[PDB]
Design a protein around this ligand. Structure first.
Ligand SMILES: CC(C)C[C@@H](C=O)NC(=O)[C@H](CC(C)C)NC(=O)[C@H](CC(C)C)NC(=O)OCc1ccccc1
Lengths: 250, 239, 220, 204, 238, 240, 234, 240
């Protein structure tokens, strides 16, 4: 019946879509997800949340998912919506591989999910998918690429971006310290740790609290390795060493 | 599926939802289109480059077919669906009634899709008004504008987006008989309209002009800067 | 295929041969024709190997789901009614002839299910290509109420007649004995026929074949 | 025979810790050869290979359809597919089309993902699985292949011996079939490495 | 107030409000009068013109040779029902090779009208009809309300100012059975004259007369054809 | 209020108000009474004539649902005509599917289940009618059932529906229904209706009477005009 | 007569951006009777407290701990009827995997598939979100796995967890113990103790229902075994 | 606590409570009736109060006890039409179980299936939750006599003895004390315990006609509805 109905897709008198804006707020509450692009490789690092001692941690990184051999994504937002979208992304990549026997390029995957996300806003009187995800991938057509998809269905190709709780602060640090045309994944990894230390209120950036995954092309194979906690620990110490060196300068 | 009319006439006799959809176009980034004697030209503003962001992904000018091209102002996501739907119709028009697609036909198709969303139950109207610029078999350059409601009007020159009214007034006042001509002058007229755009960044404004006998070419940023320099030289001449 | 079943005092012993022949060549020398419908019920299948294997799995799945909801051991009537209704719907297109035997609360039961959807409940049933031969053993040597050993000997003898008297049937004899207190499956219950040893060595020494091109891929 | 229209032959064998898959390379329509490099053994992962022989349209469609399913399974469950699991997955694909069967008879020959015990399996067009501990042959020259395999196989063979035994069996058998031949490719899988070789063959 | 919005909702007084509102639509409509005699049935209607240049909208619509329907309500609704009635008469002629009995058609019309007045979303049909017919039983006139209740009436009137027509028809109802076609139309046009505001008068342009009888297939006499029926009338008693 | 908008809503008290409002419409309807005699059932309906111009038989509230079954309706006439059509159809399906005339007990239950379905959902309004079904069979004997808008079907030796339901049942209880012959019962039905008519609250009414019984050979039929009229004469004489 | 029914989601985003109806369903899980799940190195232990209101009710007829499959079992906190609908659905999903792959469903896979059904209710129209949170346990590849699925459909893997009344106190009580070096499932005693901490009048074989999944499989402990464990419970 | 239409439709409320389902429980009590069931060592007995408000209603038609299957019987407490519909759904599900599975439905399963139908009514709006509670009696081999109750909310459990209707807190307590010291009741004792519990809670000391008793026994599995005379002999025995 009309009385028990939520408009969901109806336009505001202002002209904005109210539900989509509300969904964006949910992404803001979710944990920090940050991506930095370097010429050698593209990396996605996200902050683990609700790290209670009893959790098994057997999911091989809850935030990070591998959509295809050459593509990966991390999502901030309602977990249930994320699981539905991550499965859909994997199917779209596979369906392309069968129709044309070549891996999906990247923007095509982002646009295809984005088309679904917009469709929910467009019609059906149904709740929008309140999830925002960053896509890191390599393609023959345009090399390493990074993309961000909003709940609205609009997408972007940012070389460096953050979609988590402290996104405004992370982007400001990224804009100032990202060196365009300078690669070195190691420099990008250090920048990521510094952004994470600012974004995370908890000090010391504990290795368990953060997850880091790096996509690099080796021997023409594209390897989405996930950094081990020991690798994360050495990186945090390196950030501390730089902070200590600044203290020595002071 | 959901079967209730999203847009219903209000007592004043106006479809309120369609007016709200137009408001989304008003909030959209400004887009300017002019038709040259032989070269059709269209331009976009408010690139708002964040340095980290990549421009190719955010481009707001696309070629539906070799003959036609489009620019959009309004909700970005809605446009991506309408552009891809037009691309399918243009190729489908070739499979049936074999021949190229006339610019007027593609604008009627985009208008009919937009009207159908207003006249359909359960679906919110598209939030995009579009400038479709193309050359027909006769070679006459044609530019058309599609409202969110779904009305298409041929326009020799027009602009849509934030501060559309100011640019539209500037375009009619600055419009020159012979369409400026010389190709560069027609591009300059858009560059002058781009200067009339509030940002007036220079590099920030990006425009693409179709020869209308060949294929759409995006102006190189350095090439656009040289055209902006021509406008700056004209400003020095005015001084 | 010779598939034979007998109801003996306590329970049902189900026996089948172990050969699958595509055309007139033996594709499989050890194909299991006795299938696990449930803990208390087992089935023997002769017909299209794909149809027999798939039809059995669906019933086993539905019975396992039924047993979890019911909370009690499934009845052979349930399996048979489920199998007959599926086979009738397919109108003979699903070609599986199934001997269903299980011990339930009611007692030991044996049913013969034919592809068109007809089932007969009988003390002794034989189905398959070697079925006529096994039925001759059953008619001559079946006595109502038999000890487990006497029934096991009868089922093996029935299968052996099919193995040695039908080109289609062959290989080892497999027997599964089901009783209220115990379920025993002997996959190689008897091995009547064995391949003879090879008199002459035919091994080919390395370098007896020519390689036009070779590549090596390191793994992990 | 739809099966003999394009021709084909596949054979797999079991060794001490290795599994070998082989196929004829000829692709042809009726009696006219078209190409000598058709791929009939498609890798289904590291240490697992599937060989499809039958109508070439089906050989390609099934390998492509199987890869679509395997890739989704490998993403949804991190572990690489177990050889037994893949056989069930193919049988589900083949049975879904039981009324109109894909005209292919796949042979799967791969080592286990965590433990490394050789697995060789052969399937019918409808989808009946046939795990074996010796050899599986699924081709137009099935009978000729079976005779050589029965008379040449030995219970435990080092990778070198398994290669000679599969090589001679495919080469001698393919020679007596007119619609199959034009070269043989042997992929022998051992835990340390995968070795692919092409054997000298009568191109007649 | 809340109860008035839908047909599905029932008032605390147990009356369906939307049905009553649909009933009003018939009242805001041109007046029509139906009478019957032993052998013939006449359905005079008062056509109303939006503008002097504009032609009067047609009220009597032929359904089949034996049946004609007047309309007093939303025109588009009448067309949907009139299309159904033409189809129903056609199917009866096609399968049974006989004219559909008029009463049986009225019964089908009610069942179609009841289904919207019940189901959610669908709106009550809002047209009042005065069907006229001849069958083995004889001449018939049937009134249908938006409530889906049919009513078999020897005479009838529906629409604005119809009450005056009902009073005249009731006073002279006895005379109707024993009269010729001219008299039956003459009583019926006199009834329309009562519905007409006194200043306005019956004219060939504003009156449509439809007659079905034992020897007459439904004929919508109008314009000049209406003039002989109009002639011989006593002057309006204003 | 605010819990009475839909029939898919239960009041905090624990009732579906929409069904109750539907029953109110039945109360607004004029009375129809049915009595089970020794050999058959007789139904009489008080239908007041709103307009003299109606030719009689207009809006008839007695319907021959099946050869052996007949119904008397009180409530919105439009809702009733639909219910009679469901009843006529349910009877026809039984004769085609099982080969014999439907037992009245089954017909009342099947129609009642349909009436019940409307109450459960917000989409469809509850029915506004409370018809009574009566049948005579040599094998099963005379049976009378009344189904109300809620969907409740109860067998009644005597029953009334409408504004004068209480007055009619009280007058009905005095009659010896179990032993009275059906022809004798008709005069009584006419008397009960004439007493409960109200005289000035409603305008002049026409008495519609139906007979199902051994006299009618198990076929529901309208009372013959000669049997009627004399019944009206007794009713007018009895009231005065 | 209304056919499929409402097609519009009853759950919609708040101005804050948190779905209100899912939060209300969480309240039913917290309001639910206490349920405790502990995973020991050999096997998972699932314990829930069933206190029937009266002696009249037969405790044996209904089991709060249920076997989804031979190696997978489920315990619930929240509305009872909804748990039965999920349990039937989970058994169907587990059997469908077995039919397709001929291998018992991996424990994690059942959770994702059950969770996807739970998420469907939140997005889909007409249906209210489920009011039940489950603590699925399984023994695949030897290692025991314990997972919890919330009404929203988010699934988390827990070595130990508790849901229902006084869940927070239960979580702290487990935090004090749950060293997770218990090779044997002596955690059956700890699970009895955690339920005991929030237990009401007494703990009896009838009062507590315990199901253990080990290498052998998921077996609901017999009432006599629960009595033996309840007896001499420290 | 109220949010939006939480109390107007079957949607969750603050505190995770389905108000509409709680209102449905009140509906069972709305009908002025009570029913009690007792499970003995060898038999299970169901008793209900039959109130015929007016003599005209046929006593036989007014029954709240129905036969789901030859070996299974039920007592319905709640709105009559809704209860009659649940009876038909249960009868159909048992017929399907026999046809599909080949054995008569276990009484435990019939309850779960009717309960599962009820839970969906709560889950999906557009369907009212239902206002009837059903108690089922049957003999199951290896389970002895069994009594089961299905709530409108979809809850189901096995019941040694139970009651539903207007006065059930009193009925459960009176039975609970008797259950504590029952020591396995015999068939006469089970009928006596049920009749006495109803007699005391209603405080009516009802005569045989006023109540209906249906019993299922290990010796006679078929569900049987006791005739009034048979009820009277038990009724006098408790009276002594
Ligand atoms: C359980 C079975 C192994 C029983 C066995 C014997 O009856 N069945 C069979 O042998 C039947 C053929 C038979 C009906 C003549 N099936 C077979 O021989 C083979 C199985 C081996 C090749 C591995 N399956 C098969 O594909 O049959 C060919 C075929 C193809 C299409 C339709 C029908 C039959």
């Amino acid at each position: 019946s009309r009385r028990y109905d939520s408009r969901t897709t109806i336009f505001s008198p202002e002209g904005r879509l109210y539900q989509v804006e509300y969904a964006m707020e949910a992404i803001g509450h979710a944990g920090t997800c940050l991506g930095i692009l370097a010429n050698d490789g593209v990396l996605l690092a996200a902050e683990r949340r609700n790290i209670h001692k009893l959790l098994d941690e057997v999911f091989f990184s809850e935030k990070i998912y591998k959509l295809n051999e050459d593509m990966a994504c991390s999502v901030a937002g309602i977990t249930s919506d994320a699981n539905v979208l991550t499965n859909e992304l994997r199917l779209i990549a596979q369906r392309y591989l069968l129709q044309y026997q070549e891996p999906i390029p990247c923007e095509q995957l982002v646009t295809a999910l984005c088309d679904i996300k917009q469709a929910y806003t467009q019609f059906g009187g149904k709740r929008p998918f309140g999830v925002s995800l960053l896509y890191i991938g390599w393609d023959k057509h345009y090399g390493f690429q990074l993309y961000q998809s909003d709940p609205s269905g609009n997408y972007g190709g940012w070389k460096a971006t953050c979609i988590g709780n402290n996104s405004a602060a992370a982007v400001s640090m990224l804009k100032q310290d990202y060196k365009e045309g300078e690669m070195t994944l190691k420099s990008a990894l250090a920048l990521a740790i510094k952004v994470l230390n600012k974004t995370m209120d908890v000090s010391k950036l504990s290795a368990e609290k953060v997850e880091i995954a790096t996509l690099t092309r080796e021997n023409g194979k594209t390897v989405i390795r996930v950094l081990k906690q020991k690798e994360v620990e050495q990186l945090i110490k390196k950030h501390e060493e730089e902070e200590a060196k600044a203290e020595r300068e002071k | 599926s959901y079967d209730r009319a999203i847009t219903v006439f209000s007592p004043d006799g106006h479809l309120f939802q369609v007016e709200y959809a137009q408001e989304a176009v008003k909030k959209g980034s400004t887009a300017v289109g002019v038709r040259g004697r032989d070269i059709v030209v269209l331009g976009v503003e408010k690139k708002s480059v964040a340095k980290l962001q990549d421009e190719r992904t955010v481009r707001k000018i696309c070629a539906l077919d070799d003959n036609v091209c489009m620019a959009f102002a309004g909700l970005t996501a809605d446009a991506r669906i309408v552009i891809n739907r037009a691309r399918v119709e243009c190729q489908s028009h070739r499979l049936t009634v074999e021949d190229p697609v006339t610019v007027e036909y593609i604008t009627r198709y985009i208008a009919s899709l937009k009207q159908r969303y207003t006249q359909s139950n359960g679906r919110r109207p598209f939030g995009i008004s579009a400038l479709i610029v193309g050359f027909d078999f006769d070679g006459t350059p044609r530019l058309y504008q599609t409202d969110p409601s779904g009305t298409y009007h041929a326009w020799k020159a027009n602009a849509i987006g934030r501060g559309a009214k100011s640019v539209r007034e500037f375009l009619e006042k600055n419009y020159t008989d012979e369409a400026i001509e010389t190709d560069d002058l027609t591009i300059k007229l858009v560059i002058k309209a781009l200067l009339e755009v509030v940002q007036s960044g220079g590099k920030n404004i990006e425009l693409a002009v179709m020869r209308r006998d060949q294929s759409l070419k995006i102006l190189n940023p350095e090439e656009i800067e040289k055209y902006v320099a021509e406008i700056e030289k004209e400003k020095e001449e005015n001084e | 295929t010779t598939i034979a079943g007998v109801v003996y005092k306590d329970g049902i012993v189900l026996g089948a041969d172990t050969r699958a022949t595509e055309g007139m060549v033996v594709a499989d020398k050890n194909c299991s024709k006795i299938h696990f419908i449930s803990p208390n019920i087992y089935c023997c299948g002769a017909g299209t190997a794909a149809d027999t294997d798939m039809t059995t799995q669906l019933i086993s799945s539905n019975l396992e789901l039924h047993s979890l909801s019911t909370g009690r051991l499934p009845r052979v009537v349930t399996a048979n009614r489920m199998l007959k209704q599926m086979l009738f719907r397919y109108q003979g297109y699903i070609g599986a002839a199934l001997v269903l035997g299980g011990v339930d609360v009611t007692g030991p039961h044996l049913y013969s299910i034919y592809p068109h959807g007809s089932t007969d409940k009988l003390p002794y049933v034989t189905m398959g290509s070697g079925s006529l031969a096994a039925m001759a053993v059953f008619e001559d040597k079946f006595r109502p109420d038999m000890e487990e050993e006497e029934a096991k000997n009868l089922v093996s003898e029935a299968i052996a007649a099919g193995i040695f008297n039908d080109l289609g049937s062959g290989s080892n004899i497999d027997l599964c004995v089901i009783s209220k207190n115990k379920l025993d499956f002997l996959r190689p219950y008897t091995v009547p026929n064995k391949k003879g040893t090879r008199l002459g060595r035919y091994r080919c020494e390395k370098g007896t074949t020519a390689v036009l091109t070779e590549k090596i891929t390191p793994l992990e | 025979s739809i099966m003999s229209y394009n021709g084909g032959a596949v054979m797999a064998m079991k060794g001490k810790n290795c599994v070998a898959i082989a196929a004829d390379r000829r692709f042809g329509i009726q009696a006219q050869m078209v190409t000598t490099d058709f791929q009939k053994i498609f890798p289904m992962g590291d240490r697992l290979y599937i060989g499809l022989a039958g109508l070439a349209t089906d050989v390609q469609t099934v390998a492509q359809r199987l890869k679509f399913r395997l890739n989704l399974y490998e993403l949804k469950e991190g572990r690489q597919i177990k050889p037994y699991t893949l056989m069930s997955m193919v049988a589900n694909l083949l049975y879904e089309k039981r009324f109109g069967p894909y005209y292919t008879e796949p042979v799967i020959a791969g080592l286990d993902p965590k433990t490394f015990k050789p697995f060789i399996c052969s399937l019918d067009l409808i989808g009946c699985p046939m795990v074996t501990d010796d050899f599986v042959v699924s081709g137009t020259c099935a009978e000729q292949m079976y005779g050589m395999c029965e008379s040449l196989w030995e219970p435990n063979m080092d990778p070198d011996h398994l290669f000679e035994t599969i090589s001679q069996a495919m080469l001698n058998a393919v020679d007596r079939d007119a619609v199959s031949g034009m070269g043989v490719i042997v992929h022998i899988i051992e835990k340390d490495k995968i070795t692919t070789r092409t054997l000298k063959a009568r191109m007649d | 107030n809340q109860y008035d919005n839908d047909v599905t909702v029932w008032s605390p007084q147990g009356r369906i409000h939307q049905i009553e509102y649909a009933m009003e639509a018939v009242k805001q409509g041109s007046a029509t009068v139906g009478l019957k005699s032993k052998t013939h049935a006449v359905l005079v209607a008062l056509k109303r013109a939006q503008s002097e240049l504009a032609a009067h909208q047609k009220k009597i619509l032929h359904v089949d040779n034996h049946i004609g329907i007047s309309i007093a309500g939303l025109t588009a609704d009448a067309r949907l029902l009139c299309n159904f009635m033409r189809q129903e008469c056609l199917d009866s002629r096609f399968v049974f090779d006989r004219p559909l009995p008029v009463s049986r058609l009225v019964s089908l019309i009610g069942s179609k009208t009841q289904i919207p007045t019940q189901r959610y979303g669908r709106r009550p049909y809002g047209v009042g009809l005065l069907i006229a017919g001849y069958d083995d039983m004889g001449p018939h006139i049937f009134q249908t309300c938006p409530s889906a209740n049919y009513f078999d009436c020897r005479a009838m009137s529906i629409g604005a100012r119809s009450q005056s027509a009902r009073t005249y028809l009731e006073r002279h109802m006895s005379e109707f059975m024993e009269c010729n076609l001219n008299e039956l139309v003459k009583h019926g046009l006199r009834a329309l004259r009562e519905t007409l505001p006194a200043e306005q008068d019956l004219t060939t342009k504003n009156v449509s007369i439809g007659i079905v009888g034992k020897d007459l297939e439904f004929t919508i006499y109008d314009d000049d054809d209406v003039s002989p029926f109009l002639e011989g009338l006593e002057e309006r008693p204003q | 209020t605010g819990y009475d908008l839909s029939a898919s809503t239960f009041s905090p008290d624990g009732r579906v108000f929409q069904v109750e409002y539907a029953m109110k419409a039945v109360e607004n309807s004029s009375t129809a009474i049915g009595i089970r005699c020794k050999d058959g059932v007789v139904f009489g309906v008080e239908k007041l004539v709103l307009s003299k111009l109606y030719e009689e038989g207009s809006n008839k509230r007695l319907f021959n649902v099946d050869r052996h079954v007949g119904m008397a309706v009180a409530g919105l006439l439009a809702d009733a005509r639909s219910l009679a059509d469901i009843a006529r159809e349910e009877a026809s399906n039984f004769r085609s599917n099982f080969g014999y005339n439907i037992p009245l007990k089954h017909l009342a239950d099947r129609v009642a289940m349909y009436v019940h379905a409307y109450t459960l959902y917000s989409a469809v309004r509850p029915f506004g009618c409370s018809f009574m079904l009566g049948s005579y069979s040599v094998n099963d004997g005379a049976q009378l059932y009344m189904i109300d808008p809620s969907g409740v079907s109860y067998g009644y030796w005597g029953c009334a529906i409408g504004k004068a339901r209480q007055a009619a049942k009280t007058e009905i209880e005095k009659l010896q229904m179990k032993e009275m012959t059906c022809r004798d019962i008709v005069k009584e039905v006419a008397k009960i209706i004439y007493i409960v008519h109200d005289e000035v609250k409603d305008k002049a009414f026409e008495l519609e009477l139906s007979w199902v019984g051994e006299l009618t050979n198990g076929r529901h039929e309208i009372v013959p005009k000669d049997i009627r009229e004399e019944a009206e004469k007794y009713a007018k004489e009895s009231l005065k | 007569m209304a056919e499929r029914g409402y097609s519009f989601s009853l759950t919609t985003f708040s101005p804050s951006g948190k779905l209100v109806q899912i939060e209300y369903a969480l309240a039913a899980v917290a309001g639910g009777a206490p349920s405790v799940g502990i995973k020991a190195a050999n096997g998972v232990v699932l314990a829930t407290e069933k206190k029937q209101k009266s002696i009249l009710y037969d405790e044996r007829s209904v089991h709060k701990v249920e076997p989804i499959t031979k190696h997978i079992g489920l315990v619930y906190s929240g509305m009872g009827p909804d748990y039965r609908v999920l349990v039937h659905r989970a058994r169907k999903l587990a059997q469908q995997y077995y039919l397709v792959y001929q291998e018992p469903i991996p424990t994690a896979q059942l959770v994702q598939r059950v969770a996807s059904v739970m998420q469907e209710y939140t997005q889909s129209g007409g249906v209210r979100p489920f009011g039940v949170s489950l603590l699925i346990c399984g023994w695949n590849e030897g290692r025991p796995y314990l997972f919890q699925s919330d009404p929203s459909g988010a699934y988390f893997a827990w070595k130990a967890t508790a849901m229902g009344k006084n869940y927070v106190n239960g979580k702290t009580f487990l935090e004090k113990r749950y060293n997770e070096d218990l090779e044997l499932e002596d955690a059956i005693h700890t699970a009895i103790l955690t339920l005991k901490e929030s237990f009401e009048g007494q703990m009896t074989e009838d009062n507590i229902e315990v199901g253990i999944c080990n290498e052998a499989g998921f077996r609901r402990l017999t009432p006599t075994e629960v009595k033996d464990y309840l007896a001499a419970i420290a | 606590s109220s949010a939006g239409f939480d109390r107007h439709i079957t949607i969750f409320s603050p505190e995770g409570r389905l108000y509409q389902v709680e209102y449905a429980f009140k509906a069972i009590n709305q009908g002025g009736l009570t029913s009690v069931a007792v499970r003995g060592k060898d038999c299970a007995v169901i008793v209900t109060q039959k109130k015929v408000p007016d003599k005209l209603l046929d006593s036989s038609t007014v029954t709240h006890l129905f036969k789901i299957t030859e070996n299974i019987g039920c007592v319905m407490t709640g709105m009559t039409a809704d209860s009659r519909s649940q009876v038909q759904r249960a009868r159909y599900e048992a017929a399907n179980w026999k046809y599909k599975y080949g054995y008569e439905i276990p009484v435990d399963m019939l309850c779960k299936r009717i309960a599962d139908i009820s839970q969906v009514y709560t889950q999906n709006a557009e369907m009212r939750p239902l206002g009837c509670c059903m108690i089922l009696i049957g003999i199951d081999e290896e389970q002895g006599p069994q009594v089961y109750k299905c709530d409108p909310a979809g809850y189901y459990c096995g019941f040694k003895a139970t009651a539903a209707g207007v006065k059930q807190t009193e009925s459960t307590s009176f039975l609970e004390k008797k259950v504590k010291k029952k020591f396995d009741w015999t068939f006469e004792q089970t009928v006596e315990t049920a009749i006495t519990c109803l007699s005391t809670v209603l405080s009516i000391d009802f005569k045989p006609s006023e109540i209906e008793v249906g019993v299922v026994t290990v010796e006679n599995p078929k569900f049987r509805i006791l005739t009034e005379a048979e009820i009277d002999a038990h009724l006098v025995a408790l009276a002594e």
